[PDB]
């Protein structure tokens with residue numbers, strides 16, 4: 038099932054998402070209204086909210102409070118992105134922060150309008166994990182000595198965990214079985230991880246080399262450094278320590294191709310996508326599920 | 340009630356609140372804990388959490404969950420400060436660098452997000468859908484308010500401080516009484532008290548900005564009550580100076596002629612009078628509650644505020 042079949046299948050629910058998003062961002066302040074219009078008219082995949090509506094329908098959710106979860110999930114994501122824009126000694130810091138908070142806080146109100154503590158437990162924990170992940174990532178900047186245990190935790194915390202909570206909470210809302218619930222909870226976690234690994238290597242393939250220029254150690258980079266010639270291992274660690282090394286993309290790429298860092302990551306992402314597709318086997322075979330599997334494939338397609 | 344009589348009656352709980360706060364900075368990510376320790380150990384004041392504690396007591400609550408609601412509130416407040424210092428580009432917060440000047444903007448903003456979400460986790464642990472409903476709305480009200488004043492009279496000002504300060508005071512006392520199980524009247528009682536106290540509290544803070552970070556509101560020409568009064572009743576010269584300074588969002592180096600204008604019109608004492616008005620309402624609203632030392636303290640704090 039391709040993105041088009043997956044879009045038509047979600048067309049109606051995604052309208053519900055958009056409408057709930059507009060209702061929450063409908064206040065007097067161009068800056069905010071215009072962001073709502075921005076989000077609902079975005080020609081992007083908007084996979085996070087799609088997963089939320091898909092997960093619920095796959096477990097037979099007949100109502101439509103699942104559209105409110107899809108919406109708050111997108112808010113959590115938007116809010117985290119706005120805060121990720123804050124700069125120091127190097128929209129604007131002010132708008133990025135305040136609008137970010139507006140969206141976060143609004144995301145929490147929606148969480149509780151659902152009137153479910155379980156949902157609140159999970160979401161409440163995920164967002165705090167996400168925040169935690171953002172700080173861990175901040176500490177890792179210019180640090181070429183971080184372990185994979187660390188890194189693996191970075192992506193899980195900042196990307197995977199939100200996919201996990203979106204699938205799981207949609208399951209909870211639909212009062213599905215503990216077994217089914219764990220199917221979606223794992224599918225989100227594994228897909229989220231695959232999604233981030235693919236994202237990290239595409240950064241080497243906006244402008245490839247941003248992670249590099251910022252000194253952000255990602256798997257592709259941590260692998261070439263360890264599995265490479267001392268000549269290269271030094272250039273990489275230097276590039277990570279001083280930052281501003283976009284100019285070293287080729288030498289770094291050639292170091293990656295030499296030990297297959299990128300290929301090794303893509304392969305690692307595919308293990309993840311295959312684990313998420315597996316977790317979904319405990320669910321009734323239906324187009325909704327076919328769609329959730331279809332996303333796992335797309336997520337890792339070249 | 341006297342301050343020390345309050346610092347003693349309330350002593351034990353506030354000791355718990357302090358611990359309840361510091362045990363939450365337990366992340367595996369050291370930077371969170373450091374920055375947390377950095378900002379939470381600056382003395383603060385802790386009026387928001389003290390109100391919470393006393394409010395629970397002033398309704399018979401014999402538990403220890405009020406210590407938890409009082410802590411998260413401090414966290415929420417803490418978070419707003421971090422985020423605010425990053426927005427106001429402040430490098431000073433009471434004799435010491437702001438958290439951003441020492442750790443950087445990113446670290447402040449993110450760690451602040453950690454703290455707020457943690458406070459939110461802390462509310463769900465209490466499992467009270469109403470608290471969560473009142474508290475979340477309160478925080479969203481504060482936020483929409485900040486995005487607002489990021490884009491010229493007394494009415495406008497009384498609205499600007501409701502979102503900014505009074506509202507969290509309102510939530511502090513109300514959610515504290517609700518968690519106890521107070522009556523619909525007590526709840527409404529504690530709520531107004533917090534709202535008015537918070538309003539009074541802010542009025543005093545604004546006048547304390549014209550000496551007794553002193554003088555920073557004028558530097559960015561913001562319309563606090565004191566300034567508006569001096570404008571309306573001062574000379575047409577002092578009136579033109581103040582207005583242009585506000586339109587300019589900059590009144591830097593004008594402190595002398597401004598204070599002159601204020602002392603002449605008595606703009607500060609008038610702000611103080613207004614503060615006392617709100618403090619009376621706060622006290623007059625605690626009537627519904629039973630006469631207990633706790634309530635005597637919540638009234639004491641109202642008097643101390645003004």
Ligand SMILES: CC(C)=CCC/C(C)=C/CC/C(C)=C/CSP(=O)(O)OP(=O)(O)O
Pocket residue numbers: 138141142415418419420422423424427451452455478481482485503
């Ligand atoms: C954490 C979260 C989800 C939301 C927080 C939203 C924020 C940042 C609210 C700011 C509230 C405050 C204390 C504003 C004071 S600006 P001022 O210059 O008038 O007061 P000041 O002297 O800087 O304290």
